[PDB]
Design a protein around this ligand. Structure first.
Ligand SMILES: CCCCCCCCCCCCCCCCCCCC(=O)O[C@H](COC(=O)CCCCCCCCCCCCCC)COP(=O)(O)OCCN
Ligand SMILES: CCCCCCCCCCCCCCCCCCCC(=O)O[C@H](COC(=O)CCCCCCCCCCCCCC)COP(=O)(O)OCCN
Ligand SMILES: CCCCCCCCCCCCCCCCCCCC(=O)O[C@H](COC(=O)CCCCCCCCCCCCCC)COP(=O)(O)OCCN
Ligand SMILES: CCCCCCCCCCCCCCCCCCCC(=O)O[C@H](COC(=O)CCCCCCCCCCCCCC)COP(=O)(O)OCCN
Ligand SMILES: CC(C)CCC[C@@H](C)[C@H]1CC[C@H]2[C@@H]3CC=C4C[C@@H](O)CC[C@]4(C)[C@H]3CC[C@]12C
Ligand SMILES: CC(C)CCC[C@@H](C)[C@H]1CC[C@H]2[C@@H]3CC=C4C[C@@H](O)CC[C@]4(C)[C@H]3CC[C@]12C
Ligand SMILES: CC(C)CCC[C@@H](C)[C@H]1CC[C@H]2[C@@H]3CC=C4C[C@@H](O)CC[C@]4(C)[C@H]3CC[C@]12C
Ligand SMILES: CC(C)CCC[C@@H](C)[C@H]1CC[C@H]2[C@@H]3CC=C4C[C@@H](O)CC[C@]4(C)[C@H]3CC[C@]12C
Ligand SMILES: CC(C)CCC[C@@H](C)[C@H]1CC[C@H]2[C@@H]3CC=C4C[C@@H](O)CC[C@]4(C)[C@H]3CC[C@]12C
Ligand SMILES: CC(C)CCC[C@@H](C)[C@H]1CC[C@H]2[C@@H]3CC=C4C[C@@H](O)CC[C@]4(C)[C@H]3CC[C@]12C
Ligand SMILES: CC(C)CCC[C@@H](C)[C@H]1CC[C@H]2[C@@H]3CC=C4C[C@@H](O)CC[C@]4(C)[C@H]3CC[C@]12C
Ligand SMILES: CC(C)CCC[C@@H](C)[C@H]1CC[C@H]2[C@@H]3CC=C4C[C@@H](O)CC[C@]4(C)[C@H]3CC[C@]12C
Ligand SMILES: *[C@@H]1O[C@H](CO)[C@@H](O)[C@H](O)[C@H]1NC(C)=O
Ligand SMILES: *[C@@H]1O[C@H](CO)[C@@H](O)[C@H](O)[C@H]1NC(C)=O
Ligand SMILES: *[C@@H]1O[C@H](CO)[C@@H](O)[C@H](O)[C@H]1NC(C)=O
Ligand SMILES: *[C@@H]1O[C@H](CO)[C@@H](O)[C@H](O)[C@H]1NC(C)=O
Lengths: 344, 344, 344, 344
């Protein structure tokens, strides 16, 4: 039913499932905006496919040819099925709009499924190629941040009663390499191109005259070519073509609204803001150097992933509340850190 | 069946599922009134869609055109399907009420699903954008309250046998920022606007003459335009239109009753009452300062979320019972706190 | 099938599911009588809806109009569907009993579902508004009782080898407030009113002549108004109306039997008997004062909830067996308590 | 399918599910004979309902009226559905056996479901009212028996290298109260009465002439009353009536065989034999006094429940093997108990 389809595709965790494995425990591995874009671009065409053939919206068979009254039920069924299979056969049918509109009307669900698959492909390539590496690197970075926070609080407590910036060096090295950012931009660009092509196709499909679904059909090949009792042609109409056009314009609207989001996603350096690591600069055990901005490198992408999935880090949360309290400046950062006692 | 739909949509945890993740363990992340509003506004139109096409209420096909007796079964089926697809084609049909009523009668389930999706969108935006931040902040606040309660009871026990207000400073800082409250008000306002538009549409749909479902249909395009055996027109009726109107007025009543709730929700500062933190003011380790009221800021929203999901805090429950006992004043707050022995 | 519906709605845990959350572990949060009343009042109309359209009891379509023999199958189907949709349209049909009986016959499942939803609403309001508070308070009370029992047995063992009545003070304070009892009485009263209205409706529906299901139908609007081959009217009958009346009288009987139960529930103070706390009065560490009776206050409701869900408390069970043994008076209460050794 | 129904209702744990809660861990809370009686009396009529309308045994529709050849398919369908709905309407039909046989033939599944529900009601009342109390009491009794066994074995080991009969006093007190036994006897008696009424009904249904399923039907009310082309009456037959009678006699046989079991159950004191507590009399720490027999009191019912669910007690099992070995008398009870070393 329509409501069942809605529950499956919008109100359920459709493509929102976290990786089912212990390797990525709590790691999104995909930005929220990218996940939203993929979920829409994939589950919208599927939802429209399901809707267009819902038991309520669908009168019945997808084509009716209006055989003569003399024709029996199965003769008329032969006519309808023959014309359905003959939309491909150009000789059999003669339609003013041509045969491409008939092909599109017959295979619209296939085309929507193709677009959905093509849009799901780049996210899958990301999740299967560049996701494990960033997952491992980000897990190491979070562990290093937790360890340095613990060491700093232990030092502060000892004072009240190595020291090498490994994480900073690793981030600096990431500043050079750009394979991950190149893959990310390539997959986003392919998604954008697929969306644009889908918009072109949907606009063309919705621009039809709405009468191209009606085509003339001739069961006059073979032994029936010279038969007399059979009329030379029939009036066939492809039902649900109006529904297809409505859903196609809906998908076109959604995709044109979505494309600016993908374009904004492509410009990762601009998105790289609100320095996540700036909060850690007040730790004595952490060097006061952010050095993450203004670069078409994997460093900006790592900064984005950190700003996305750093809320799970207790040390980061503690430092963030310390920073927020520092806005008033009533107290002192080391005193607040010592009082917090948030090692684990 | 009707009962199955009821069990799925009203008697089950439809959209009442808690976040399936360890990050939010026991945190609602959504006020009870907001959750009720979203659940109604989403699962009502879906329930009505399912009901309108239930196997019992539905006689059968959604349109019957009453072809002549001479017409065969599949000729009549062609007529019915053609008219169903031609509700869009204005030339084919001539109805007194126009063609918009026919469009609405055909696509009412789609319109209800659209309203449900549009009403579910703002809650989803909230849960995916502003929910993680408030979850982390509120978890930190609850942990700080538990820790300060434990410290105060330990101090009392030591007396019987830092001290910095970090949580108060954090709340004071939240008094300034307003991004969360702005997002909350924006999503509530969008929900209200969607509800009002849905009410307008449902009132228009229910105001129809009830005879607009009957339209005249002409299969007279193409080779059949000059055919003689076919009548110039047919009498088609869209079945289930009365059911659609009944369910639409039901949804209109529900939404007009719900809109005052959304308006009351918009006025969060008025809702900010029954100070949750007032109970903690009797703790020696906690400063006697509430400072949370009369502000279009995130502080009021945080106060609401606390008053919602603070019952899970053992320290808060203990302080609440101490406060309630203090109404008589027979005993002493520190003595009762020491006797309680409710560290964990 | 009928047996499947029975298993789902009477032999299964339909609305008998305990709260699926760790917050309420073993707490009913709903009295047994109230749960029985809600389960009946909700799952009876749903069961009757399912039964009335069971594949065995149902001959087939819900209306047959007996078109002339000259009419084709789909002409007759058009007639039947038109009349089904025209039960609303007063002009189309002319029935002796009127049009309200036809509306009721068509929408009886909707009306039963409406009554079920309206009866499920007050229980849901209770469980979502007043259940968390009573759950927290009752959990605290049980924990306090366990702790005082442990302290008393420890004192007795020490003798053989604070002391403040916090729980008693909390109960005394609850004696004043009445918001929970007011909500309980309001929800019970609304349930009673809904049940009475349902009884009125079912009595009216069952009082019909049983021939109102037969109505005269006229497909004579539009181009067919002046058509000659079509008869001026048809004889239509709404099938399953007898089944609807039978099930409606069954529901009426059940609801009239149930209403006295709801009225008895409304009088909570009378139900407040068999003092649960009287057993704890023999503990040296517990003050000898019950002070819970004869009040339209939340104290009586808390006493009811205690008498309901106190069997899970080992200390209460031990004190109950001590009390029962004290009926003979052969031994001594402190000696029996010491011998029991039931700390945990 | 038939085999699926069999698997669900006889070969599966239909109504044999243990209470899904930690409160009753391993406690039957229902005697084996009572559970068997309830399972049969409930799942037999449901199984017969399912069988009577199985896709294999069922030819098709439940009534066929044999309309004239001139009648079209949907005219005949109208006739059949009209007569199906008119079995209630006495004026419409004229049958030699009357109208009650037709009512019974139409609503036999409803009557079987009613009997199943009425037979399931007393067991449900028991499980929801008197089951928690007996569960708590019996758990306490088993814990006391385990503790006294442990104390006795510890004393024996100490000798080789309070003392109050709390459980005996509790059982003696149970000797007085009779509310549980009264409820048990009342529910068993109601089950017996329901079974007898079901037997009466099934005997009456099976005693029919087998031709009462054939009734004369007249679609001659309304505009068709004076119509000429329609015959004055039709020959309608209610299919599956023979299957209903066969299954009804099967159920009658099962229930008449079952009723003696219920009568034997009612006489609980006679069932109270094979003293379970007699084995514990050899323990030095346990007083040598059974005092459980010859009483219409809850003590006999508790003895039955003990004899039912005491096999789970390791101490009871050890004492039972000691008793069995004592039949030969080769050894000594205290020596065997010391050698067993079965504390836990
Ligand atoms: C993806 C979207 C693809 C849509 C665009 C396809 C490009 C078609 C270009 C060739 C057109 C062509 O050969 O001319 C028409 C015949 O088309 C044809 O006979 C070819 C029809 C094109 C294939 C359409 C079917 C798509 C199936 C997708 C399946 C995906 C499933 C994946 C799981 C003639 O007619 P006319 O009207 O152009 O001219 C008639 C008067 N000059
Ligand atoms: C959402 C609710 C939308 C309802 C309001 C739509 C505004 C329509 C305004 C344009 C009307 C128009 O062009 O005029 C009518 C034709 O309408 C048309 O042909 C356009 C019909 C409007 C589209 C209705 C279909 C909604 C589909 C929703 C799908 C959602 C799915 C999402 C998953 C002519 O006829 P007349 O009677 O106005 O005048 C006839 C005598 N002057
Ligand atoms: C809930 C139970 C509601 C039943 C009582 C409704 C009160 C009806 C009062 C108005 C009656 C009225 O206008 O008069 C009749 C027309 O009724 C009408 O045309 C209005 C019919 C009333 C609506 C019945 C449909 C209930 C649908 C429930 C849907 C719930 C779904 C929720 C998920 C005329 O005929 P006459 O025989 O009275 O007089 C004919 C000779 N004077
Ligand atoms: C439960 C088993 C109930 C069976 C016994 C019912 C007692 C009927 C007594 C009244 C009989 C009566 O009024 O006389 C007959 C009409 O019966 C009637 O018109 C009344 C028919 C009785 C209702 C049968 C339908 C049972 C529905 C059970 C639904 C349960 C569902 C629960 C979920 C006339 O005809 P005649 O042959 O007696 O005399 C005809 C020549 N003098
Ligand atoms: C997904 C991508 C590939 C879709 C590409 C656009 C498709 C949908 C449409 C839009 C415009 C279309 C073209 C419009 C006009 C003509 C001229 C005609 O004589 C042959 C077909 C041809 C050449 C069409 C082929 C298909 C076409 C290119
Ligand atoms: C992503 C955005 C830009 C998509 C917007 C949809 C645009 C591309 C659509 C809307 C209407 C469409 C046109 C409608 C009709 C025709 C005439 C046909 O003989 C050739 C294709 C052509 C010229 C279409 C090309 C694509 C088109 C211009
Ligand atoms: C969800 C929102 C967009 C719904 C907006 C209201 C819709 C349902 C209805 C209510 C009143 C309607 C209008 C009423 C009157 C007219 C004048 C007519 O000559 C053209 C259509 C037009 C202009 C209608 C368009 C659709 C309309 C605006
Ligand atoms: C949220 C609340 C205010 C909704 C209440 C429903 C209101 C808006 C509905 C109920 C009846 C409706 C009117 C019914 C009939 C017409 C005539 C038509 O030619 C234009 C629209 C118009 C004028 C409708 C406008 C909207 C309307 C006034
Ligand atoms: C659930 C509640 C609202 C149901 C209320 C009772 C319903 C079922 C029935 C019972 C008696 C009925 C009334 C009986 C008589 C008349 C007089 C007639 O000229 C108009 C309808 C009217 C006024 C009926 C309206 C509907 C009615 C009130
Ligand atoms: C909860 C209890 C009291 C419900 C008992 C059912 C009662 C209320 C039912 C049973 C028969 C019913 C009556 C049957 C017939 C008519 C005639 C009609 O023109 C007006 C309604 C009226 C007068 C009904 C009113 C309600 C009624 C009296
Ligand atoms: C479950 C219980 C209520 C069933 C009771 C027995 C039912 C099945 C049957 C068995 C015998 C039957 C009775 C036999 C004879 C007559 C005399 C006739 O002129 C009216 C019906 C009446 C009075 C029957 C009513 C229904 C009846 C009582
Ligand atoms: C539990 C045991 C005793 C049930 C045995 C079934 C008995 C009660 C059945 C079997 C045959 C039945 C009888 C068959 C026929 C008739 C004639 C009818 O006009 C009145 C009922 C009457 C007289 C039935 C009464 C009940 C009956 C005697
Ligand atoms: C049909 O008859 C025509 C007559 O002109 C002939 O040319 C043609 O070959 C025939 N077709 C078949 C399939 O026999
Ligand atoms: C139908 O016949 C008419 C006669 O006036 C002619 O004008 C029209 O073109 C014909 N239509 C078709 C589709 O051949
Ligand atoms: C039907 O014919 C009658 C003849 O009196 C006329 O009044 C009426 O307008 C016609 N109806 C239609 C819909 O053409
Ligand atoms: C049918 O015709 C008879 C002729 O005697 C008449 O008495 C009766 O009222 C008519 N019935 C209807 C429903 O018009």
């Amino acid at each position: 039913a329509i409501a069942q389809l809605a529950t499956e595709y919008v109100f359920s965790d459709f493509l929102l499932k976290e990786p089912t494995e212990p390797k990525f425990k709590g790691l999104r591995l995909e930005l929220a905006v990218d996940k939203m874009v993929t979920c829409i671009a994939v589950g919208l065409p599927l939802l429209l496919i399901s809707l267009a053939f819902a038991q309520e919206i669908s009168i019945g068979t997808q084509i009716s040819c209006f055989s003569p009254s003399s024709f029996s039920w199965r003769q008329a069924a032969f006519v309808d099925s023959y014309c359905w299979a003959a939309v491909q056969q150009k000789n059999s049918l003669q339609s003013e709009s041509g045969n491409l509109p008939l092909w599109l009307h017959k295979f619209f669900p296939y085309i929507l499924l193709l677009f959905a698959i093509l849009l799901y492909l780049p996210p899958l390539f990301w999740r299967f190629a560049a996701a494990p590496h960033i997952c491992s690197d980000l897990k190491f970075i979070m562990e290093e941040l937790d360890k340095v926070y613990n060491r700093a609080i232990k030092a502060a407590k000892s004072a009240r009663d190595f020291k090498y910036p490994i994480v900073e060096q690793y981030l600096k090295t990431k500043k050079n390499s750009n394979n991950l950012i190149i893959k990310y931009i390539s997959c986003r660009l392919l998604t954008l191109i697929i969306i644009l092509l889908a918009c072109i196709y949907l606009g063309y499909y919705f621009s039809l005259s709405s009468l191209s679904d009606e085509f003339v059909c001739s069961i006059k090949s073979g032994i029936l070519r010279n038969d007399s009792t059979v009329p030379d042609q029939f009036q066939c109409k492809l039902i649900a073509v109006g529904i297809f056009q409505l859903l196609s314009v809906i998908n076109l609207v959604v995709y044109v609204l979505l494309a600016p989001v993908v374009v904004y996603t492509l410009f990762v350096p601009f998105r790289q803001k609100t320095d996540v690591l700036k909060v850690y600069e007040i730790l004595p055990t952490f060097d006061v150097l952010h050095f993450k901005s203004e670069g078409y490198n994997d460093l900006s992408l790592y900064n984005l992933f950190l700003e996305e999935n750093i809320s799970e880090v207790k040390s980061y949360k503690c430092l963030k509340v310390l920073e927020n309290i520092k806005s008033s400046g009533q107290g002192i950062d080391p005193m607040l850190l010592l009082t917090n006692l948030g090692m684990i």
